[PDB]
Amino acid sequence: ETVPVKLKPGMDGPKVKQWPLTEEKIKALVEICTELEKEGKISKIGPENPYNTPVFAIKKKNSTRWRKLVDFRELNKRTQDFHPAGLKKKKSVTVLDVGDAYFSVPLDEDFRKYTAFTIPSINNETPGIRYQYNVLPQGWKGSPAIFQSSMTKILEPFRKQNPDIVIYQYVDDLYVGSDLEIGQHRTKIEELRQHLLRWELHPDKWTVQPIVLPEKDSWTVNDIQKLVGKLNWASQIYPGIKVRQLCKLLRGTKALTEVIPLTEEAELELAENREILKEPVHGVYYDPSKDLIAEIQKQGQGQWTYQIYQEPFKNLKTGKYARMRGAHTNDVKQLTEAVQKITTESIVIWGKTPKFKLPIQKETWETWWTEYWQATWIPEWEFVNTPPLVKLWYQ
Amino acid sequence: PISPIETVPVKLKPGMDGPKVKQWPLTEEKIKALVEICTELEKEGKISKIGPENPYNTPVFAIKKLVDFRELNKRTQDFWEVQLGIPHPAGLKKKKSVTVLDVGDAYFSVPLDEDFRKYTAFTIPNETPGIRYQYNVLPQGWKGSPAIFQSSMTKILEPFRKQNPDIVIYQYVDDLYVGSDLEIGQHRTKIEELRQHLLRWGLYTPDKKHQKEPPFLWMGYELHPDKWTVQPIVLPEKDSWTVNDIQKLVGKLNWASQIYPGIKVRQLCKLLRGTKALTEVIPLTEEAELELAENREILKEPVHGVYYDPSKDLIAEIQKQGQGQWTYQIYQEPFKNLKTGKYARMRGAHTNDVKQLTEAVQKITTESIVIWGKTPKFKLPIQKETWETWWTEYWQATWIPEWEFVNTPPLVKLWYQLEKEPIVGAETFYVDGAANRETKLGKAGYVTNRGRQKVVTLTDTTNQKTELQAIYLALQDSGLEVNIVTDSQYALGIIQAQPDQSESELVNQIIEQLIKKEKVYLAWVPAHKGIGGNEQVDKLVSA
Numbered sequence: 001e002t003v004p005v006k007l008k009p010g011m012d013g014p015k016v017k018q019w020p021l022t023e024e025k026i027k028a029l030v031e032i033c034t035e036l037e038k039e040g041k042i043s044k045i046g047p048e049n050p051y052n053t054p055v056f057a058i059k060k061k062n063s064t065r066w067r068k069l070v071d072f073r074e075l076n077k078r079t080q081d082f083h084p085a086g087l088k089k090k091k092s093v094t095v096l097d098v099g100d101a102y103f104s105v106p107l108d109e110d111f112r113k114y115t116a117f118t119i120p121s122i123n124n125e126t127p128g129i130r131y132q133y134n135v136l137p138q139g140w141k142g143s144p145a146i147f148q149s150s151m152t153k154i155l156e157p158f159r160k161q162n163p164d165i166v167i168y169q170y171v172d173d174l175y176v177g178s179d180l181e182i183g184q185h186r187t188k189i190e191e192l193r194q195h196l197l198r199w200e201l202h203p204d205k206w207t208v209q210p211i212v213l214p215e216k217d218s219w220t221v222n223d224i225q226k227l228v229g230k231l232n233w234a235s236q237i238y239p240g241i242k243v244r245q246l247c248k249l250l251r252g253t254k255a256l257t258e259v260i261p262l263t264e265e266a267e268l269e270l271a272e273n274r275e276i277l278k279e280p281v282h283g284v285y286y287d288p289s290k291d292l293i294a295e296i297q298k299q300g301q302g303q304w305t306y307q308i309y310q311e312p313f314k315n316l317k318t319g320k321y322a323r324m325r326g327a328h329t330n331d332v333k334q335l336t337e338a339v340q341k342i343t344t345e346s347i348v349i350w351g352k353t354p355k356f357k358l359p360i361q362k363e364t365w366e367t368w369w370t371e372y373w374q375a376t377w378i379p380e381w382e383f384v385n386t387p388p389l390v391k392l393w394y395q
Numbered sequence: 396p397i398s399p400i401e402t403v404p405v406k407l408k409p410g411m412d413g414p415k416v417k418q419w420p421l422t423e424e425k426i427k428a429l430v431e432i433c434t435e436l437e438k439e440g441k442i443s444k445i446g447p448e449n450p451y452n453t454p455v456f457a458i459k460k461l462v463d464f465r466e467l468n469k470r471t472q473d474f475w476e477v478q479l480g481i482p483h484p485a486g487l488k489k490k491k492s493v494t495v496l497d498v499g500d501a502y503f504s505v506p507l508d509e510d511f512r513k514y515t516a517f518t519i520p521n522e523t524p525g526i527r528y529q530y531n532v533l534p535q536g537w538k539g540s541p542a543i544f545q546s547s548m549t550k551i552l553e554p555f556r557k558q559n560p561d562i563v564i565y566q567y568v569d570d571l572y573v574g575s576d577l578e579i580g581q582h583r584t585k586i587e588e589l590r591q592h593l594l595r596w597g598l599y600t601p602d603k604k605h606q607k608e609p610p611f612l613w614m615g616y617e618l619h620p621d622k623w624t625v626q627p628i629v630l631p632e633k634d635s636w637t638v639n640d641i642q643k644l645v646g647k648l649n650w651a652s653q654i655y656p657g658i659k660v661r662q663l664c665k666l667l668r669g670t671k672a673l674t675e676v677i678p679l680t681e682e683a684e685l686e687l688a689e690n691r692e693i694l695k696e697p698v699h700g701v702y703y704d705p706s707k708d709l710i711a712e713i714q715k716q717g718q719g720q721w722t723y724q725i726y727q728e729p730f731k732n733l734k735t736g737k738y739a740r741m742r743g744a745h746t747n748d749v750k751q752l753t754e755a756v757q758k759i760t761t762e763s764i765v766i767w768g769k770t771p772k773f774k775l776p777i778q779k780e781t782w783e784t785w786w787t788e789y790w791q792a793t794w795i796p797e798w799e800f801v802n803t804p805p806l807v808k809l810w811y812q813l814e815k816e817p818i819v820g821a822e823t824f825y826v827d828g829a830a831n832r833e834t835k836l837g838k839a840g841y842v843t844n845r846g847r848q849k850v851v852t853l854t855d856t857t858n859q860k861t862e863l864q865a866i867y868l869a870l871q872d873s874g875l876e877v878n879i880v881t882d883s884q885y886a887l888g889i890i891q892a893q894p895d896q897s898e899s900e901l902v903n904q905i906i907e908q909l910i911k912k913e914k915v916y917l918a919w920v921p922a923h924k925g926i927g928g929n930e931q932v933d934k935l936v937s938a
């Protein structure tokens with residue numbers, strides 16, 4: 001028995017155009033799909049079906065085998081509708097790919113048409129191969145839901161037999177957190193792996209990083225100026241930040257290189273601001289009824305800074321990401337990684353993907369991101385122009 | 396020749412209903428014809444007579460038949476897009492031979508969804524009852540007829556394909572391109588086999604004695620199964636030239652620019668300036684003459700290439716033609732081009748060569764993926780150091796697939812570089828600008844540590860043009876090494892980005908100025924604060 005599902009009132013199925021793919025990735029799919037066809041998970045469709053959703057293939061480099069990924073973002077948005085602060089604190093959380101479970105469940109006939117997608121051909125030599133789902137599609141919002149029941153059961157055992165652990169599900173991913181030192185955590189997981197079969201993350205380390213002010217032995221007109229600007233901007237967050245004494249040391253038309261001693265008051269004003277900046281600003285609270293936002297700036301040399309916030313100047317969390325182990329000189333690589341990492345934390349903390357604001361040109365992102373993606377889900381995003389200001393700050 | 400292929404189930408847009416239009420008169424002649432014609436299809440099985448229950452109808456015509464479903468189509472569900480994607484020659488892979496079986500009758504021979512047929516009812520015209528039938532097959536000019544015909548085609552081909560892997564087929568409207576690596580007779584044979592297989596489903600197709608012959612002409616080319624040639628292009632020789640003529644000429648010439656090196660249209664395009672009507676005539680300037688003649692020569696030389704060899708790598712090389720213009724050629728073996736093209740300067744806001752090259756490279760990568768499913772190894776007229784220098788410092792994420800430097804000037808370089816720290820022993824200009832946004836009157840000036848100073852009033856300017864202006868003056872009245880401090884973020888941004896081309900004159904001026912200088916350091920400070928020399932110019936450019 002399959003539960004009936006409907007599109008929000010008035011809405012119609014996606015008719016998103018398919019992106020062109022690499023040979024490498026095209027083959028992967030015909031393979032993956034002829035298999036799914038045999039097993040009857042999906043089936044070829046007729047021209048009378050006008051809907052479409054983009055598909056492509058990635059590999060969580062947790063394998064060398066290819067995995068099929070469908071971009072239901074559009075569909076999910078057009079689909080009717082129907083979280084623990086725990087892990088948010090846990091010592092360690094591990095993520096599990098349960099996409100599979102869905103393929104065990106059949107999809108309401110009347111709704112299948114909407115899940116249509118297309119395997120393209122090169123140079124257009126041929127028409128693409130069109131299929132539509134017969135089971136619950138991975139990445140579809142409706143799936144985790146409908147599979148809820150079956151899911152809860154399956155878990156319950158490991159649940160109240162390990163209550164000293166938290167288990168959260170987000171789409172095709174299961175987040176499991178415990179305080180058990182690495183030894184028991186890793187084993188308890190494998191213990192859970194087999195349990196499901198029979199059918200590294202660290203939350204607290206994520207704080208709003210501190211704004212640091214530079215310390216010089218000698219200050220030039222330039223130096224002071226640069227410091228006053230940063231401070232000034234910073235006053236938006238901390239209204240207590242004063243810049244008067246410093247603005248004094250600068251009055252007159254001096255040369256930028258000219259060195260300037262700091263008046264004892266300038267000294268104070270400065271020391272006082274350093275203090276204020278020793279803690280995130282007060283009164284910042286996650287508002288469930290508002291969109292989460294993630295913004296990222298390219299600091300260069302491999303670094304990237306970012307902020308999750310809902311309202312301007314009231315950051316919920318901020319961070320930096322640098323390139324570890326693996327000669328990576330490829331921005332796009334880095335940015336996709338960066339975006340995943342971040343979407344991940346959001347999910348953990350609040351269990352919601354953030355709306356991204358990317359420092360890259362549409363064309364560039366579109367042409368290559370897919371090449372580095374390694375997640376069952378896909379957040380929302382828009383492209384922008386980094387104001388040099390916001391950059392020197394988080395730098 | 397009706398097909399015994401399962402029909403595609405059709406339906407009308409959500410909650411709509413069949414066409415109910417009425418036709419009153421036509422001549423004795425126009426009625427005689429239609430009666431005959433119908434009776435023909437009638438028997439062929441194409442159509443049938445309907446009666447009791449069909450409340451639907453449509454205007455029938457006679458043209459020296461024609462049925463207009465304009466209304467039916469509006470009420471017909473949407474189908475799956477036929478796909479505008481077209482194979483491009485450079486994508487094709489060499490074959491020994493390739494014929495084109497022409498279906499034609501194609502659609503008219505495909506069963507129409509039974510259920511839907513009712514809606515396809517039409518009447519013939521002054522007694523009592525006239526003549527009424529309904530379609531039984533995919534009707535000429537109907538909405539789903541294309542879509543439905545191709546799907547059917549594909550099904551019918553699917554087995555044959557699976558049994559003849561070696562054999563490639565391309566379905567294009569009413570034509571079948573079948574090529575292969577078999578010998579001359581084995582091929583001719585398979586085509587025949589293919590034909591009876593098609594004719595085995597009511598899909599009549601021409602015999603070996605009637606099919607069209609190679610090379611086939613395709614979206615611009617003349618192509619055989621082992622090579623292709625740009626079907627040569629001629630330019631009309633004429634006494635008088637109308638605007639319209641000129642325009643088409645430019646289009647042809649423009650298209651040629653892709654394949655043909657050296658084509659130009661500057662003086663030819665000039666002729667359009669001021670034109671009052673398409674039918675107007677323009678005295679071809681002598682300069683236009685020289686150019687027109689010149690192109691005729693370039694068009695004379697034949698150009699031909701070859702297809703893609705999966706067993707070889709692609710190589711794309713780019714040249715910097717003018718400012719923002721780029722030429723590129725793709726090949727698997729030197730001088731043996733697979734495809735070439737050109738990209739016009741995308742005149743935009745404020746950019747620079749490295750960024751632009753980056754885009755060209757991006758455009759090509761995309762195109763290449765579409766055609767070959769792979770991205771070429773690139774040869775770029777840019778120094779590795781240049782690229783490193785630029786990217787590691789550009790605020791935006793940028794990238795270039797694996798490539799290598801090819802020293803084929805002119806090369807793309809950075810026209811100037813801002814200093815990382817203030818210049819020791821260089822004048823310091825504290826520039827500022829601002830304009831009343833209600834009147835658009837503004838002031839822009841500066842002051843320096845070296846006592847110097849200047850200011851200027853401006854009309855109809857805007858805030859941003861003012862601040863830019865301010866920096867221009869500073870750049871002007873400054874000499875080889877400068878330190879400029881502005882309170883404008885707009886400017887900081889623009890310039891911080893090291894632009895070498897813009898559509899704003901002032902910005903161009905500044906750029907020019909920037910290239911001129913020996914060392915320039917631009918710095919920014921918050922506007923309207925007690926801060927430095929800023930509060931000095933702040934006061935002088937007021938309102």
Ligand SMILES: Cc1ccnc2c1NC(=O)c1cccnc1N2C1CC1
Pocket residue numbers: 125482487488489490493563564565572573574575611613618619620621702
């Ligand atoms: C127009 C067209 C589109 C796609 N492929 C082809 C063609 N036509 C050809 O003449 C052709 C030429 C060379 C190689 N493949 C070709 N064929 C392939 C089918 C044998």
